[PDB]
């Protein structure tokens, strides 16, 4: 499923991402935009044999288990296939745990490169929330 910017912004607010651990809602929409282009079924195979899954490209080496990644840890205690749903519940749950680590949202490389230090609120502007 490919979300529209405002559609995801509204769903993410509904999933309590607005102001979760000091991050404004715009950070999450921008992040999803640059991590997966709002595509919930997006996947990317990495060099280390790990795969990033879902709307928020969650890594199979540290966060979810896809049964195919070497030094896997499954920090989110969930199967990677659960982050490929049109339902963003599992992806949001895991992302919240990821961000609760000291590195915060810096775990999302695309977010780092394209959102951090940018006017992130613009991503929820012009939306019926």
């Amino acid at each position, epitope marked *: 499923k490919v979300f529209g910017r405002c559609e995801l912004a509204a769903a993410m607010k509904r999933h309590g991402l607005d102001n979760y651990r000091g991050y404004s809602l715009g950070n999450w929409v921008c992040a999803a935009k640059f991590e997966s282009n709002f595509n919930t079924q997006a996947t990317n195979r990495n060099t280390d044999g790990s795969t990033d899954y879902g709307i928020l490209q969650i890594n199979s080496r540290w966060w979810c288990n896809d049964g195919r990644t070497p030094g896997s*840890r499954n920090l989110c205690n969930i199967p990677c296939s659960a982050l490929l749903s049109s339902d963003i519940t599992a992806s949001v749950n895991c992302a919240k745990k990821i961000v609760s680590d000291g590195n915060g949202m810096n775990a999302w490389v695309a977010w780092r490169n394209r959102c951090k230090g940018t006017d992130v609120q613009a991503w929820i502007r012009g939306c019926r929330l």
Partner: antibody, heavy 113, light 107 residues
Framework: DVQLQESGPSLVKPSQTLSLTCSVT????????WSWIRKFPGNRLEYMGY???????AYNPSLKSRISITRDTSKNQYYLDLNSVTTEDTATYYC???????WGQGTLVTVSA | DIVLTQSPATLSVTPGNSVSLSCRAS??????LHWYQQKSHESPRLLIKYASQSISGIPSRFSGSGSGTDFTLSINSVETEDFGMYFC?????????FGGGTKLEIK
């Protein structure tokens, strides 16, 4: 499956340092976030803090920085150090993972002169 | 610090009836509100995750709802094993905080 268990002194004196160890059986401590929660004599629960997989920590400001949460990969345990305790720190301490799915049995620690 | 207020402090019910426990946040926390059950000489047990997400291994009679600052924990048809303490907790902002708790007793 995973199981947690608190251990350490149950009686300590004022101004000393209270230390508890949480032993984790079933999986590596490096595969989760770990925390410490305590219950005061009046059903008052307080989230003390947690240590992330990275070793980064979050401490409740209410502890005025007397708390320290560390871990030992080799022994597969994580600890809690609470400095300069007072009768105010008399409570039932529990260790549980960040998600709160796994909890220990809880151990009462009385601070007394 | 986000403050959680639970009402009522105590609730008396007859096994078989239904009850709803309230928890209000001094500030909005979206859906980041969790419910715990605690019985004497026992550590807390997670009943509901993020306002309304159910937990594997927990009776179906437990359900939660609400968002923002107003949340509720419902128990459709109370059972004897359901008597004990119930606490809500928010993870939206550090430090995580718990509500004072609501005690559920047999009528």
């Amino acid at each position: 499956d995973v199981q947690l268990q608190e251990s350490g002194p149950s009686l300590v004196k004022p101004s000393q340092t209270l230390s508890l160890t949480c032993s984790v059986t079933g999986d590596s401590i490096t595969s989760d976030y770990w925390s410490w929660i305590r219950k005061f004599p009046g059903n008052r629960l307080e989230y003390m803090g947690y240590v992330s997989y990275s070793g980064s920590t979050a401490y409740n400001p209410s502890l005025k920085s007397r708390i320290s949460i560390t871990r030992d990969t080799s022994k597969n345990q994580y600890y809690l150090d609470l400095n300069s305790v007072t009768t105010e720190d008399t409570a039932t301490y529990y260790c549980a993972n960040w998600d709160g799915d796994y909890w220990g049995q809880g151990t009462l620690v009385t601070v007394s002169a | 610090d986000i403050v959680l207020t639970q009402s009522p402090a105590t609730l008396s019910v007859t096994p078989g009836n239904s009850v709803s426990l309230s928890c209000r946040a001094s500030q909005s926390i979206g859906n980041n509100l969790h419910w715990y059950q605690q019985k004497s000489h026992e550590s807390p047990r997670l009943l509901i995750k993020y306002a309304s997400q159910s937990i594997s291994g927990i009776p179906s009679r437990f359900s939660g709802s609400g968002s923002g600052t107003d949340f509720t924990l419902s128990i459709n048809s109370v059972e004897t094993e359901d008597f004990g303490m119930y606490f809500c907790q928010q993870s939206n902002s550090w430090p995580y905080t718990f509500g004072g708790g609501t005690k559920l007793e047999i009528k």
